[model samples]
Target: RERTVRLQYGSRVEAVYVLGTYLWTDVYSAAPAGAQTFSLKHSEHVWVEVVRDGEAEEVATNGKQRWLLSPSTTLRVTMSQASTEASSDKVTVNYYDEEGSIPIDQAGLFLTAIEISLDVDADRDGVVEKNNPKKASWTWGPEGQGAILLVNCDRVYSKEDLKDMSQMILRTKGPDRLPAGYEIVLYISMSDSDKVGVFYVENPFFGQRYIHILGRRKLYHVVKYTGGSAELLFFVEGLCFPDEGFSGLVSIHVSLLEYMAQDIPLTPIFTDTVIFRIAPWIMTPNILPPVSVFVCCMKDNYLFLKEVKNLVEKTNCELKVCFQYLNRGDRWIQDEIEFGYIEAPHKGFPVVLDSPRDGNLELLGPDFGYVTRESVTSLDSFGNLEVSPPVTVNGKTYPLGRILIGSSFPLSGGRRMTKVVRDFLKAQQVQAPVELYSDWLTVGHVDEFMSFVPIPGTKKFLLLMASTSACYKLFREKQKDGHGEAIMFKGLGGMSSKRITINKILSNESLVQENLYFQRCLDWNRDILKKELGLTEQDIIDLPALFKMDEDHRARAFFPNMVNMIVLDKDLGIPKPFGPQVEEECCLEMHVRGLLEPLGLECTFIDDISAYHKFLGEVHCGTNVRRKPFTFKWWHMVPSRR
Candidate 1:
């Protein structure tokens, strides 16, 4: 089992990592990428390429991360093509530990084979797979740890009802050792209260289905998980009333596909509903493997949902088609769900106005302490919040007006105040100029603060916002330049970026906060936030690896981290590109600003902690002030101080 293996230098081959086996390479004769009727197979990959002038790079199946040849400096080659074959012939690469010989292929065989087992066939096919998922993210909240990924249903009534589905899959050690309750959560986004949507959650283990109503107006719907290894599906739908074209639609049907079984409690579990409960055994790499099932469907509605069920009893594929309302549902009901397919998501990437790392205090009018049903409120009588009990700041007593914070609402469907509040602060005689910091990368918009002395003393602040769940390279030296660096933003990479559309990648408020919100600092945030953000939960599963051979979880792709700007004391003796902490008097004084300003009667923003979100960002959430509360206040969404 621990034996070493080696491969020939030239000629290319395709292969896969088989469990409990050695690194593999298949042989091939590629005419051209566009060659007609080419016989291709999954895991068909090459070991090495021909060298013409030492300019040769190893060609590969998955090329995002490059695989290479020997450690050499002197030039020794030109490009050369390998011989041809219908199916790739086998080729082997060198694997070694003795120095100055040949480098071991290091392509862990059994490990890679095991890794393939985690794949969650998005459509429940016998093969492992990946697909784009629902993207309409949820919003942040006071206690629920804002923007948790609202996991979705498995299948939509129609392609149009939900549009497309993106998925991530995972594998655990055993079947009995599964995480319990809160296995799934369905998130429904609403913009208006005029109309609403309804759904039901069916518990397969308990055989109970409960109908639930969405309370938010114009809501967005996606399910969530409570940390388990079971196969789960979430769905999102465009809701609508008759002749309304899916306007009232906010969420999708959530239920465990019920099966009419014989000897088993539930017959080969399968349903046409969006959400389906999957046991750990359905997806496997080997036959007669750990209790698995094989399910396959090819976009044909006429296919009976029970077909797979019939196949299940005869094969290892235990579960089959659980849902198929395509032609069997009532015409009117079917038509309404059908209309959802026609709806189009708004164009353009998700955008945010501020970053709250340097806390910008929320102004919750007079009733700040009153706990009400809604947390989002209008600021002015004209839809803007007004500050209350004007306090003295900078030697002047300015009447602090009032603006009430009400329950949160969706970004797309909110009251449009249609105006921007640009006021930073008011001085007795001189005005403290305001500067806005901003940056744009592949994933989403980025921003920050540009002032050093926020209040002419020890206190300071930083602001910014990121809309995507990705990581950006902070700095890297150019290949030719010895002393310089280049930073890159890597969100979705290779085919991973193309498999799904922007339409399915919503700014999930819940996942953004609970699973995705990352601390900018590398230390305290790492250890502390790790537990705070539920990263420490061994039960928390990430599907990207199994689903698409995804490398999206690396620090560079997993977390979206970018610093646009920072302002500190001008005499800190640090370079513009400061890597070390300034730790100076002015720098220290800057810290005191947010604390003193609020007590001084002028508004104080929260410092020390910054929160990033998908929609309403860390800055001024768009408010429609009717000129009632004329003050510039972006913190209307924050809870009122006691």
Candidate 2:
């Protein structure tokens, strides 16, 4: 790249600095007028040229070259050797009047030289390269080049391995001394200093091994270079996460400064910069194999916990139960936290995303990393957040899939996820987020109406959506088939007085109207899911479910919502939706089995009616799942420019 410097015009000595290669200056403008002849003098290693009207001619450094100075003359200077000491050489310009033999005016240019480079793994080849041209910008693809940084969010399991940060090197090659008047400084932007930290080893085998060099309070770290061919090691740690008012990309700059004395300010001779982008926190889809399943044990939910234990045991996964002592009556484990992980070329670890809703239950441990955001509302609960399996849409592929969150409609005013959480998800880049209208429900959450289940076919997974229309259609079909007297919610303790026959439910016009409004809401999100997730009608399986409006005119599940179910590989722990009995089976269970069993899914309907469903939750809402991390490395992804 061509760098331009302004030449000082005076008799006093002025310093000129060059970093990588060529430096240009306007020679004619810096000279006095009425000049007859001008001569240039420079060292043997430096090249100087005069350009007039785009034509260039080399000026000999042996003090024998002269040129007629004009208003349009320009000078170009280049160094053939890297600087090993301060003030490598000097260039002198002398001018003479038309008739005078002695020079009228002269300018002394002192050239200082110092080679500085900050290196990272910009090429993604697992090795740091010196002075990469593409280090300042980041792109995506196999041919792309840029440094990747992992968020240092994980807690150290052992005391011996506490420093979990990306490595960086400050390389300098110079003489034994940096010259009396020169210094090297490294720094970051004030806005970025809080998000990233730079540390150096103070003592390899002593107290406080790593000393903070640059971070939140410190903006610049002056380098004390000992000698030639020296490399100063540094650890770069991400302090804050990608959220509102913060992007993950950060840059560190190194500058060579010249300070003439205490009275004068330091002059930066040359500077180099390198950029790093923090790795995003990624969520694993349900299609991934489950490693552990978590649920809470409570006084009223003993049966519910028992059923979850049976289902998890059959899957050969660990079942973690939060006893009432620690849970303190908070049974919504899924609402309190979400599971995700961060990765880099050097290291990776699982990170638990703690929900803004501060429940009594605590799950973070030494082996797990933790992250959370502030200023969250009810909609920021983890139950409202989810991700899809790998998908392709309109010729673009999301190998890491996309995130799904619930929010209000664009023109309407309702509950929406906090902006901090939304910004955090969007900044991840790889798993682009898609928002759906879910504020129509009493307890607004996407998990209340939609879920993904693994299938046996080529599609890999299928989207299960709660369909009000399908539920009404099933009731009408049962009535038409002479099962009009069959009753739902039969023999259940709290639901006995609320029981209704198929014919009575079908004839309830007010109830039907309420569900009609809900159907429209579900359809709105259905279209968005299809467009945003690149799904077809065939890729989705509509499960039978109905909704009833509360006193505030917000929808709530009429029965246990079957779509809100926990998926463990091929096994599904579904909510026991109590529907009219057709023959010896509940039609709701039969209908769900017919749709999913053919796709190689084992449905275990857990009875969470009195314990959970009565409180506006179900099996999925009361439980959480931790799955295996994705095998694909995050650095391999080519993020979209936006």
Candidate 3:
């Protein structure tokens, strides 16, 4: 499975290897060095190992045998004149071998190192390339290999910017256990060295998972085939910016069987450009492959679903309008689906997500308490709840679970939901906690303010939510500076249209109260989050937005609930338009663009004003993500869900 490219050198000849590929070389002393003009494949990872040539014999004296690189640098050959009866001359070569072998060092005639060049194109062509297609467009190469790849590289954002984007998906398929030497490398060129939060999926047992959050400055065989097609998932939330295009390229160094053991450069094999360009407003990650969106389609919701249907279809993700209605007795689906009932796939464990009450929601106890993989807990309406036979881990007691963020309201099983999550995860040895977002808001749900930000490849997560401070700042900046009236009537500061004044906006006393309520809720929730999730100040990204209590008695977000947006994966997002109120002023879209552009996220805001939001929930509540299954890395899961 090895190919040897002969190297002839009379004088010093140069060979070029690509900056990101791998190459190896061996020297033969007998042949010496010959100068020849020949093409060498471009490589990124250059490696060299020696076997045989002018060394101590490990086998028969026949020169046909090859040995591993000599560990000893001193390979000495001695000539002596000796004989039994007459004087005779004899030559013997000895190359001592050990753990660290140095080849052909007879006095100083050894190969110390090989000179290489950075940029190399075996042929005069543009950047080596391949294509990673949308799911339906995917086609296998010969024998379940040679699948195409897509990459995004070298993008930058400012320090003041924010990118709490969702996870992205990259997939690769193969028929059998791929040849050993082959690998799928996701090269993230980081702008700041040693930054945190960048990740990739590593476990192959989950399917060909590309969502593994691999760190910077490392190589991994992310895709290893055991049975059939392999897939990779991603959720890139790179920290820092200031690069060419993307924060960096996600190159898939696919396993090439035809050239398995043969020396080849990686750049030529994996140079597909799937994404490029960055500004602010970005498409939701949900549009990326392996991440699909599914919405419940009832007779009344067809119109609302249509708006979501229109936007998600235009993006790269699969859109499914699951047709079903919940009868009075069958409220399980609606009840569970209303909260944090995530609809993600698990390779072979279909039952985990088959029914609405399955998966994470199944952990909820009768009265809404929860149990982890360890113990169980219960609750009371007095808010003086306690865990039964408190479960302790490593001498410290964690929450029944860490967090299951959903606002508690009297109507929405406030104590019930909270208790169920606590007890269920405790019994399962999982530690998940539940936090309220707006206890006073009628349609209170976690999706109303916060969202799940997953980076492919690892369990690390970032939550993107509505930031009360950012909204208040904007509110105050305009009102006191007289900019509010200017933006409303005069079309000033990038504003193009006129609207009602702060007088009327303030006329709704509840709206004003709601703003402060959001600020308070956010403040309390952030503190709880800091303690429960072990989040640092930087880990929390506050978007420039807020929600207000609407006249219909339903709370409405001032900015299209950007936090309510769905993540297709890591590459794109689908945000909802705040309608003429914000769009006409141009501030909403302008702010949105700046907020997302620096994160390398692209967006296509669909009009959903009178549709779903009127009902009090945003886009995410109306839509659900049908995520592709990855090999379950049990160890990587939060203890609350085990």
Candidate 4:
């Protein structure tokens, strides 16, 4: 596209130039002495060539120097005799450096504003789909390469108010071509206080993306690319906080997700200077779509395990699961293969399969390197790793600790170490800060008390725990009204044969001591959750259920327990059904189903009596979910050297 410049002195135009495809200009002239002003139609990248001719032919002036033009104001010119004797009328060379020229909020060449479309089931098909168009969010940037938005955060107090601070999402496009065995990367750098998040696509073996780095402080991407140019898509998610009175910048460009990716040192294709500026925005219109689900499967021969396998296979997530099996000869599958260690494996860390059975697990094992081995107690379904986000100690933030929830039982047939588990986790590079609370239960696992649950329509999680107060209140109410004894004890082996005694269950001194001990454990765990996870009481979703003392000295739940449910995704759930209460019109299972219905999550209550409950385990124990691991750049998970 060529265009003409209509200048006042077009006759004296020596040459006209066009830059790339957008810019065009001609005929440079001197400015007046006072109140001088001039302007150009297009503002970016303008330049003027100095010449010695008014009408007559002459050499280029000022030794081939080019003057950049500024549109804001005019420059004051000074006339002087030409240094060259050949021509005396060469115009004085002038140039101006554009201040604030480097944009602080441009998404640059390879990035585009990402408008995330959330999945919706318009026809109520029970499947979350994009075809129905539930919602679309511009909470991130609408388009890339614009100024940062100035948000009014001074008034933000509540969570609803904090929504004023929107997230920014940018569509990342790697150059259309790549070399064999090499993948694309986005060298992402951001300022302090601003957070970054990225998740990989599902199914790694079939050429899909998986999650890696989930830290908040920094981000870099390095992963294998398997499909066409458009097969894999990546978006940048940005969040800001009120504690940091936010004015931070994000420097991004199409460098390697690493300066490199393979074991060999990878270098950046584009260096520091080629980055795009991310401007501050009050907030995004909304958060992006939900993350895909990962299912964890166990390798077993039991018919019940097969049922669980069938259920997980029907879901809409990636068709993948991790498999590890315990021989029937072993103590119990639930006791041996707890989901915590199996799913959340670390590279150099070796999880102790011999919690209590180091002697019987006699597998002579430190299963190192690549994944699992049978003798070494490796293999798993899917791993859910919860780590302490950079903790502040001595007024400095350190990002090196791991956090896990488990049952600590040193006194009995408990499978894991009570006191030394933390030491072992430390060697495995995991930090055990909270007191593991399940040791008292015959089951002795941490999943009974708490779970990290996914929140719909957002990229955040909630801490769901069984409420002690709710449990105590329910116990007292059941004690006052003795109508449900037959229902509560139908599946209990020892109590089923005899009429239950109310005094022995409620008044026994040892039972009372057990109740008090459990209460203290709950209180202690609450403190740890608040301090370490930066969560308030409001962040925890309390499940209305309680555990009672069974005749065999094992813990049994009379009412349906809410904490024992499995989250298939933000929209689907599978909870356990109570055996006795199934005949009632609206029982515990019904209550839980009703409770989660408002959240728009579909629920299914399955029976796990013979395989799981009698063995002292719940739904989460018998079945594992293999979620696609998060893939974040290794650089983002560490401290910022910059």
Cα-based lDDT for every prediction:
0.22, 0.78, 0.37, 0.36
Rank list by lDDT: 2, 3, 4, 1
* Candidate 3 residue-wise lDDT at 242: 17
Candidate 1 segments exceeding 4 Å error: 1-54, 57-69, 72-92, 95-231, 235-642
- Candidate 1 on 1-642: residue-level lDDT in tens? 221222223334222222222332221122222222211112243343333334544444333322222323111111122212222323222333334333333221111111112232223323334321321222212221111111122211332333232222322222231112212223233442223333434353654343332434423233432222344432222222212222122322222222335454432111111221111000000101112221222224222223323323443333422222332211111111100001111111111112122223321222111111102112111111112222233344222221111111234243322122212111100111111111111111111111111222323221112222221111111112321222111121332333321212222344334323232212222232223222243312111100011133212222112122111111111111111112221211232333334423122111111112111111211111111121321111222221
Q: After superposition, how far is residue 549 of candidate 2 from its true place, in Å?
A: 2.1
Mind giving the per-residue lDDT tens digits that candidate 4 earns over 324-424?
43432232232342222211111112122323224233222233111122222211111111333323444433333335545444565544433333443
Worst 10 residues of 3 by lDDT: 115-124
Query: Lowest summed lDDT over 10 consecutive residues: which window, candidate 2?
Result: 154-163
- Which candidate leads in lDDT? 2
Alpha-carbon error at 444 in model 4, in Å?
A: 4.1
Q: How accurate is candidate 2 locally (lDDT)?
A: 0.78
Comparing 1 with 4 on lDDT, the higher-scoring candidate is 4
TM-score of model 1 vs. true structure: 0.17
lDDT of 3 at 135: 15
**Candidate 3 local lDDT, 40-79, one digit each (tens):** 1111122222233433322222233334332231122211
Which number leads on TM-score?
A: 2
